Amino acid sequence: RIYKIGTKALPCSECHDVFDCTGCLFEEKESSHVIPLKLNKPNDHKKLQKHHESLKLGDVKYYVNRGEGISGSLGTSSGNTLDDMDLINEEINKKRTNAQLDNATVEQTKENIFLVPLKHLRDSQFVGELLVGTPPQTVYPIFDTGSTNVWVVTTACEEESCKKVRRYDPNKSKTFRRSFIEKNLISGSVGTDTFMLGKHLVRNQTFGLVESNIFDYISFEGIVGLGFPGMLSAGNIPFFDNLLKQNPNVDPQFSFYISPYDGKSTLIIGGISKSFYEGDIYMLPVLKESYWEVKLDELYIGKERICCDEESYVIFDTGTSYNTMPSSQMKTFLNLIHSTACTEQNYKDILKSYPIIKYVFGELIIELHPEEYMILNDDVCMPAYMQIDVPSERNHAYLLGSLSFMRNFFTVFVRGTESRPSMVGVARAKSKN
Amino acid sequence: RIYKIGTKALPCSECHDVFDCTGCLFEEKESSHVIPLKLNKPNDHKKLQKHHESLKLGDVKYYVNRGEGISGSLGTSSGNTLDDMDLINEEINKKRTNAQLDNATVEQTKENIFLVPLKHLRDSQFVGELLVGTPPQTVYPIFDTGSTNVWVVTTACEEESCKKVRRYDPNKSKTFRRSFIEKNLISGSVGTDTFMLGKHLVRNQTFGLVESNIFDYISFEGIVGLGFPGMLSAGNIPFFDNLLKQNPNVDPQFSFYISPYDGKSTLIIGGISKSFYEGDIYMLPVLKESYWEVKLDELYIGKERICCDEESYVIFDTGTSYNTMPSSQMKTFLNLIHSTACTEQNYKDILKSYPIIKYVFGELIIELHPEEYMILNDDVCMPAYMQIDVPSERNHAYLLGSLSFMRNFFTVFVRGTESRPSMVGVARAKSKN
Ligand SMILES: *[C@@H]1O[C@H](CO)[C@@H](O)[C@H](O)[C@H]1NC(C)=O
Ligand SMILES: *[C@@H]1O[C@H](CO)[C@@H](O)[C@H](O)[C@H]1NC(C)=O
């Protein structure tokens, strides 16, 4: 559910301070620039099951750093991915069992904490058609509000023994040019080429190229960053800014409809579609233009308030599946929300007692009921949340992703211009009925 | 509630292995050796409120050692008592704010944990009349299954400016003799004298003596240990063994009825009273004869199992008010059980949703419903549990005390002889109606 408490919400045009009126109503602009999104080709949640159980003992924290993942996403230079949960668990156990082997009086002492750096969190299952070069080659990248640059996996292969599959070969483009870089970046390089997204042409687009078969290491064909221009882009016009500069009649906004079980998922450039949501679109101001990052005031699990006594922020990250909470909040969470047997028809009765999760931004309230944050895995119901600490800043980051948040809320990302700041819009998604 | 699952419980006489038949039914023996217990003169639970909040941050553990408290009870040689929660909290904050100032890759690191050693846990509010010496002087000690020796606070004072109060002066006894000790023990010494407990005379009883006004440091007039003979008694016949040797018709058992709001609380020597309990008395074998310590199999808070994957034991400790759990279990507990506003008549409606706490010993089940483990403090409902770690042994100890457990269950302590092992008996207390 989404609603504003207090005074009835008003159009954002009627605001006094555009930076302070959380929960105002967005002017809806219908757009015809639709980009269908499809399932990326495995939907296996055993990785998240193991991740939860590895937190049972209370001494394990997963973390990522701001900007250090592929394309400027959250990550580290480690080799750990979430797909590596059995290697990770084996190492955790080895490390723990080697340490247990190796007027008022209070006594300071040290406990062992095991940190698991994650390489990146890029694991959305929804990809869209991108056309690259001349004559055009089709790739299916993730469209990622949590990334800044464009990256494409190259799979060029001229030998006769190469498997016959759809490949992206930058040298088959008449218009591809390789750029000169003085940074030794599985290998990375930078080039430029022409792209087509939907009906929009985007020339002179700088992008990174990943070469080695290579999909043993990588789980996406590409990343189109929809973040902000800044140090993380390094003078290279990001894709969406480049689109806007070359297609001047497009309003600087894009929206996302995630409908996993209908095949109707969609990215919309330059506007929204009234058929994707119910009610109004409620606006949150972006506090730090880097990720799409919004100040978080409180967070409730039922009656229990778990946040926020310190500075907290929610990142809307379309390129990641799960929601996240920091390590202290997930202690409470995993005590309050249990995985259970669900079958598939017993599920509405099982979850009848689970608690509502309530995010509070000013007077704007976003609820996730249990059939909105629980997912099915074999015959087991599971909460679609990961424990992720973002230590980079003294503040605490929460992530809202595609499997839980966006499947239930229609989301609008509005770039701030000369007559508006950057904002995220949210509306109840169209009810599948 | 108390009940046995599986086969219907049978009298303990019908057992095969007397060490293995948990939940058998005790032969009831009525006894006339009743010792009324009264409220000790302040019933202030603000100390436990502060104790709970000092655990909020997850980095503070209270601990006691086996045998190191007064009379061989649980404690340490520190000066911290629970009455010192403001000194304790001030030190915790000072220590914390001085430290924040001063194929698979996992990363070991250290977190700070603050340990708070507690001097002792002797805080029951129920005391009984003991007569000491010739002509007899009245003291009101705690009768303490968690202690081993007899200790009495001496308050001798011959100066004219001494306050006129009931004092215990060992030198006013014609039969008191001071013993020779080679251990510098506020000061301690040992003597012997004659005691009377109820109708039973106990001559040649060795006991410790505490001298300094002295009740600024101590909160009890004395301790009569009802533990076991062993190293912690050091060749000095403990009180109850001495009673039995000199009064040979007394069966080696004693029982406790705790009725705080009726003035009907009672210790019963040599048997029980059928008017203090409903249903049958269910027997648990004592696994380690030192404290009255019983093996614990599982512990549930509602549907959630919090114990036991490692060796756990319950200590029945009549000299302490609150129940306890180790530090890891109270993390879960304080997330699942909250303090709240209660008034005094709103209480049955408030607690309607709280979870049942279930202790599991073999097939014997002991439940505490919320109106049995919650107590009132001002207009606030609070759980009568402390976090106590007993690090002395690799195993984990749980305490059951007087304010919660014994107020709701009638308890029988049965000394093991040539034709029985030591056992604790439990029955639902007589319903006040
Ligand atoms: C191509 O894009 C770059 C940004 O990386 C810009 O500075 C440059 O002027 C553009 N060149 C042309 C020919 O559009
Ligand atoms: C007094 O008690 C002690 C135990 O501390 C015992 O060894 C001794 O024999 C007793 N003496 C008499 C006279 O009863």
Give chain A as a 3 state SS string. Answer: CEEECCCCCCEHHHCCCCCCCCCCECCCCECCEEEEEEECCCCCCHHHHHHHHCCCCCCEEEECECCCCHHHCCECCCCCCHHHHHHHHHHHHHHHHHHCCCCCCCEEEEEEEEEEECCECCCCCEEECEEECCCCEEECCEEECCCCCEEEECCCCCCCCCCCCCCCCHHHCCCCEECCCCCCCCEEEEEEEEEEECCEEEEEEEEEEEECCHHHCCCCCEEEECCCCCCCCCCCCCHHHHHHHHCCCCCCEEEEECCCCCCCCEEEECCECHHHEEEEEEEEECCEECCEEEEECEEEECCEEEECCCCEEEEECCCCCCEEECHHHHHHHHHHCCCEECCCCCHHHHHHHCCCEEEEECCEEEEECHHHHEEEECCEEEECEEECECCCCCCEEEEECHHHHHHHEEEEEECCCCCCCCEEEEEEECCCC
- Residue A248's contacts (CB-CB under 8 Å, 6 or more residues apart) are none
Q: Is residue B368 a part of any domain in this protein? A: yes
Residue A145 CA: distances (Å) to CA of A239, A315, B162, B384: 12, 9, 80, 49
- Residue A280's contacts (CB-CB under 8 Å, 6 or more residues apart) are A9, A25, A26, A427
**Residue B377 DSSP code:** E
What are A422's two structure tokens? 């950057």
Q: Is residue A213 a part of any domain in this protein? A: yes
Minimum-distance ligand 2 atom for the alpha carbon of B236: 5
Q: Are A12 and A21 in contact (CB under 8 A)?
A: yes
Same domain, B286 and B418: yes
> In which residue are the tokens 């304080």 written?
B334
Residues in A touching B338 (Cβ below 8 Å):
303-304
Q: How far is the CA of A204 from the centre of ligand 1 (A)?
A: 6
**Positive or negative torsion for Cα B285, B288, B289, B292:** negative
Tallying the residues shown for chain A, one arrives at 433
Residue A277 CA: distances (Å) to CA of A21, A29, A144, B307: 22, 13, 21, 47
Q: Are B142 and B401 in contact (CB under 8 A)?
A: no
Q: Are A286 and A278 in contact (CB under 8 A)?
A: no
Same domain, A291 and A243: no
Neighbours of A209 (CB within 10 A): 23
> Is B171 in a helix, a strand, or coil?
helix
Q: Are B276 and B418 in contact (CB under 8 A)?
A: no
Neighbours of B184 (CB within 10 A): 6
Q: Please give, rounded to a whole number of angstroms, the shortest distance from the CA of A209 to a CA of chain B.
A: 26
Query: Method of determination?
Result: X-ray
Same domain, B250 and B359: no
Amino acid residing at A278: E
Q: Please identify, among A253, A268, A286, the residue that sits at the C-terminal boundary of a domain.
A: A253
Q: Is residue A258 a part of any domain in this protein? A: no
- Residue B74's contacts (CB-CB under 8 Å, 6 or more residues apart) are B64, B65, B66, B67, B68, B120, B121, B146, B315, B317, B388, B390
Q: Are A169 and A181 in contact (CB under 8 A)?
A: no
Residue of A nearest to B76 (CA): A105
Peptide bond into A24 cis (omega under 30): no
Which H or E run includes B61? strand B60-63
Same domain, A213 and A300: no
Q: How far apart are CA B206 and CA A386, in angstroms?
A: 62
* B312-316 vs B323-325, strand pairing mode: unpaired
DSSP character string of B208-266: EEEE--GGGT-S-SEEEE-S--STTTTTSPPHHHHHHHHSTTS-SEEEEE--TTTT--E
Same domain, B22 and B66: yes
A59, A114, A62, A58: which is closest to A84 by C-alpha? A62
Q: Are A253 and A415 in contact (CB under 8 A)?
A: yes
The CA-CA-CA angle for residues A58, A64, A65, to 5°, reads 135
Same domain, B234 and B290: no
Q: How far apart are CA A68 and CA A252, in angstroms?
A: 27
Chain B touched by A328 (CB under 8 Å): yes
Task: Sort A82 into a burial class: Cβ within 10 Å, 0-12 / 13-18 / 19+.
Answer: buried
Tallying the residues shown for chain B, one arrives at 433
Q: Please identify, among B254, B285, B308, the residue that sits at the C-terminal boundary of a domain.
A: B254
Assign residue B204 the CATH number of its domain.
2.40.70.10
The CA-CA-CA angle for residues B421, B427, B433, to 5°, reads 160
* A423-429 vs A60-63, strand pairing mode: unpaired
Q: Is residue B268 a part of any domain in this protein? A: no
A127, A299, A88, A100: which is closest to A219 by C-alpha? A127
| Residue A25 bridge partners (DSSP) | A11, A282
Q: How far apart are CA B115 and CA A94, in angstroms?
A: 27
Residue B392 CA: distances (Å) to CA of A393, A395, B68, B74, B397: 41, 39, 10, 10, 10
**Positive or negative torsion for Cα A41, A46, A47, A52:** positive
**Positive or negative torsion for Cα B160, B165, B168, B174:** positive
Same domain, A423 and A284: yes
* A187-197 vs A200-211, strand pairing mode: antiparallel
> In which residue are the tokens 């030998």 written?
A159
| Residue A53 bridge partners (DSSP) | none
Same domain, B71 and B10: yes
Q: How far apart are CA A267 and CA A258, in angstroms?
A: 9
Q: Are B74 and B390 in contact (CB under 8 A)?
A: yes
Q: Is residue A297 a part of any domain in this protein? A: yes
Q: Please give, rounded to a whole number of angstroms, the shortest distance from the CA of A302 to a CA of chain B.
A: 12
Catalytic residue list contains A144: yes
What b/e readout covers B146-155, taking b as 16+ CB neighbours within 10 angstroms?
Answer: bbbbbbbbbb
Chain A touched by B364 (CB under 8 Å): no
Residue B206 Cβ inside 6 Å of ligand 2? The answer reads: yes
> Is B127 in a helix, a strand, or coil?
strand
Look at ligand 1, atom 13, and give the residue with the nearest C-alpha: A204
Which H or E run includes B153? strand B150-153
How many CB contacts within 8 angstroms connect chain A with chain B?
A: 101
B239, B294, B278, B217: which is closest to B23 by C-alpha? B294
Q: Is residue B259 a part of any domain in this protein? A: no
Q: How far apart are CA A169 and CA A165, in angstroms?
A: 12
The half-sphere exposure of B319 on its side-chain side, counting CA atoms within 13 A, is: 32
Minimum-distance ligand 2 atom for the alpha carbon of B203: 14
**Residue B356 DSSP code:** P
At residue B96, φ and ψ (nearest 5 deg) are -70, -45
Intra-chain end-to-end CA distance of chain B, in Å: 17
Same domain, A281 and A249: no
- Contact B95/A106, CB-based, under 8 Å? yes
Same domain, B249 and B280: no
Neighbours of A381 (CB within 10 A): 22
What are A131's two structure tokens? 């056309």
* B253-257 vs B266-269, strand pairing mode: antiparallel
Q: Is residue B413 a part of any domain in this protein? A: yes
Same domain, B286 and B389: yes
Residue of B nearest to A106 (CA): B116
CA dihedral B41, B44, B47, B53 (to 10 degrees): 160
Residues in A touching B105 (Cβ below 8 Å):
78-80, 91, 117
Q: Is residue B103 a part of any domain in this protein? A: no
A117 vs B84, B105, B304: nearest CB: B105
Intra-chain end-to-end CA distance of chain A, in Å: 17
Q: How far apart are CA B34 and CA B265, in angstroms?
A: 10
Residue of B nearest to A118 (CA): B105
At residue B398, φ and ψ (nearest 5 deg) are -115, 140
Same domain, A220 and A289: no
A413, A415, A411: which is closest to A428 by C-alpha? A411
Q: How far apart are CA A295 and CA A365, in angstroms?
A: 13
Q: Are B286 and B416 in contact (CB under 8 A)?
A: yes
Q: How far apart are CA A211 and CA A170, in angstroms?
A: 11
Chain A touched by B88 (CB under 8 Å): yes
Amino acid residing at B352: K
What are A412's two structure tokens? 């609008």
Residue A6 CA: distances (Å) to CA of A143, A171, B101: 36, 59, 42
- Number of domains within chain B: 2
Q: How far apart are CA A67 and CA A234, in angstroms?
A: 13
Rg (CA), chain A: 22
Peptide bond into A308 cis (omega under 30): yes
* A312-316 vs A396-400, strand pairing mode: parallel
> Is B47 in a helix, a strand, or coil?
helix
Domain with B401 in it? 2-33+39-90+113-123+276-429
Residue B233 Cβ inside 6 Å of ligand 2? The answer reads: no
DSSP character string of B291-326: TEEEEE-EEEETTEEEE-SS-EEEEE-TT-SSEEE-
**Residue B174 DSSP code:** T
CA dihedral B388, B391, B396, B397 (to 10 degrees): -50
